């Protein structure tokens, strides 16, 4: 019918519009967030196709090196660190903090502080 | 019914579903990014009603000890730390890492460790 046709057309417009609305806010909101966690925690967190987390420090000595954490994570479990070129360099640290203390946050924090100290004018 | 109307009904459903499926994906993903951010950095980043950032250590003495940051400028990547009840207890850490050195990373990093130190290991 003429009423049905026109009545339905509005639904499509609205839904299509919602899709556009949804994407814009979400894109904008997510981008702003990630900046906060970088600016704040001094780690950029990148998801890989494999849902593994790659962290690159703000104070990283080299652009190329970074850390990658992978999780079995069906649930919110604890991740296990996968070896990277950078990861080998910072031995001990891991022993002290991950192997022994078992706290990823302590490891990063320690690492972050360490990197800062190295960062020097000359 | 009408071939014209049928198309709209099918069109509508997909579009509703497309938004529908899309919203679901964020749920899984957003949580998955946060919990990773949380277990790794040892901080839960929440965005307030006033679009301020509220941080809470995985090692918090009591719950509701949080910290709040507000972006000074939307464009400018630097955030002021707002006074809060828990902020009072870290006069020291603030003095050293936030003004003397102007580094949230340093500041949080060094805090995460102090709080991690006060964990009854009984």
């Amino acid at each position: 019918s003429s009423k049905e046709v026109a009545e339905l057309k509005k639904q499509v417009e609205s839904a299509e519009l919602k899709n556009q609305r949804l994407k814009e806010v979400f894109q904008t909101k997510i981008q702003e967030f990630r900046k906060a966690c970088y600016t704040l925690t001094g780690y950029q967190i990148d998801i890989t196709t494999e849902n593994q987390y790659r962290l690159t420090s703000l104070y990283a000595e080299h652009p190329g090196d970074c850390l990658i954490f992978k999780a079995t994570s069906p649930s919110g479990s604890k991740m296990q660190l996968l070896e990277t070129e950078f990861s080998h360099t910072v031995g001990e640290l891991i022993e002290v903090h991950l192997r022994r203390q078992d706290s990823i946050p302590a490891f990063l924090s320690s690492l972050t502080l360490e990197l800062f100290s190295r960062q020097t004018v000359a | 019914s009408s071939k014209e109307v049928a198309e709209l009904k099918k069109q509508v459903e997909s579009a509703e579903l497309k938004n529908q499926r899309l919203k679901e994906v964020f749920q899984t993903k957003i949580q998955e990014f946060r919990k990773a951010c949380y277990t790794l950095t040892g901080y839960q980043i929440d965005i307030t009603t006033e679009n301020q950032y509220r941080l809470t250590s995985l090692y918090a003495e009591h719950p509701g000890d949080c910290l709040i940051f507000k972006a000074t400028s939307p464009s400018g990547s630097k955030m002021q730390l707002l006074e809060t009840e828990f902020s009072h207890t870290v006069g020291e850490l603030i003095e050293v890492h936030l003004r003397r050195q102007d580094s949230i990373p340093a500041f949080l990093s060094s805090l995460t460790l102090e709080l991690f130190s006060r964990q009854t290991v009984a």
């Binding site: 814009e24 806010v25 967030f33 | -």
Partner: peptide, 19 residues
């Protein structure tokens, strides 16, 4: 002011960034 879908959208996501 604020459009409806946007308002609707905004609330859904803002909820997704708490507890």
């Amino acid at each position: 002011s604020p459009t409806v879908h946007t308002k609707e959208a905004l609330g859904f996501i803002m909820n997704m960034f708490q507890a």
